Amino acid sequence: AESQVERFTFQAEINQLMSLIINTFYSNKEVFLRELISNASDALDKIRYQSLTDASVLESKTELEIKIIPDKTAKTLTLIDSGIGMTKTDMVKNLGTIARSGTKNFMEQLQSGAADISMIGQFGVGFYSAYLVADTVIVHSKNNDDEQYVWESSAGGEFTIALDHTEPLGRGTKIVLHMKEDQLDYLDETKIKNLVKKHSEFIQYPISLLTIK
Numbered sequence: 252a253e254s255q256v257e258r259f260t261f262q263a264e265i266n267q268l269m270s271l272i273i274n275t276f277y278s279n280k281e282v283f284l285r286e287l288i289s290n291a292s293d294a295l296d297k298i299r300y301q302s303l304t305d306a307s308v309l310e311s312k313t314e315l316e317i318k319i320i321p322d323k324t325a326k327t328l329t330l331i332d333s334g335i336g337m338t339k340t341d342m343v344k345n346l347g348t349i350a351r352s353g354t355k356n357f358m359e360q361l362q363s364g365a366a367d368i369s370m371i372g373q374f375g376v377g378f379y380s381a382y383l384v385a386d387t388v389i390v391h392s393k394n395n396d397d398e399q400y401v402w403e404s405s406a407g408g409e410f411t412i413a414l415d416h417t418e419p420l421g422r423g424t425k426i427v428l429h430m431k432e433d434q435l436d437y438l439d440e441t442k443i444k445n446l447v448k449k450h451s452e453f454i455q456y457p458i459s460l461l462t463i464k
């Protein structure tokens with residue numbers, strides 16, 4: 252097999268944020284689940300609204316749903332949506348190379364005490380909450396306008412993007428969190444089942460919890 256892999260450097264402030272998220276103790280890291288579900292919901296909304304003005308956008312995948320997959324053997328939590336998806340350029344621009352002023356301000360407020368980790372989503376950097384519980388994050392995504400791509404980072408100032416040769420999504424995003432050893436309790440069946448219930452009260456799309464044994 253062969254793949255071309257492109258390597259990118261994180262914007263300096265995003266690199267600093269990732270370092271802060273990883274190298275500091277946080278008591279309650281539950282916000283990561285809220286943020287991942289929120290992104291899935293937003294993506295489903297986007298394709299849903301696009302369909303109202305152009306019905307054909309749904310032809311790649313008719314269902315609009317979220318699947319959450321804890322896998323203890325693999326030490327992974329996977330969240331799949333059939334939302335809008337991201338092109339390669341979408342992933343480069345949205346997941347590391349561009350920072351908004353929310354990043355600097357969040358780090359300031361974390362240090363001053365004005366903000367805690369649970370408010371990360373108010374600063375426009377909700378995605379990076381994944382690194383509270385994960386050593387490596389892998390983002391597989393398929394947008395109607397591009398081939399399926401896979402973004403991966405274990406922080407440390409770099410991410411990679413490659414044409415995806417794993418299972419076709421049709422359309423949407425599959426995010427795979429490789430869980431830190433001390434955060435593996437997030438993969439416990441009843442714990443994740445109940446947290447999903449807790450962080451999906453206002454979600455208007457079906458959620459399926461698929462526990463891998």
Ligand SMILES: Nc1ncnc2c1ncn2[C@@H]1O[C@H](COP(=O)(O)OP(=O)(O)CP(=O)(O)O)[C@@H](O)[C@H]1O
Pocket residue numbers: 286289290291293294332334335336337345346371372373374375376377378379423424
């Ligand atoms: N499942 C998904 N499908 C499509 N795009 C996604 C996605 N998850 C993340 N993204 C993209 O990455 C960007 C960054 O996500 P992130 O959650 O950090 O910020 P956000 O724009 O959702 C505001 P917030 O900080 O409130 O969550 C999003 O704006 C979106 O474009």
Ligand SMILES: [Mg+2]
Pocket residue numbers: 286289290377378
């Ligand atoms: Mg978000």
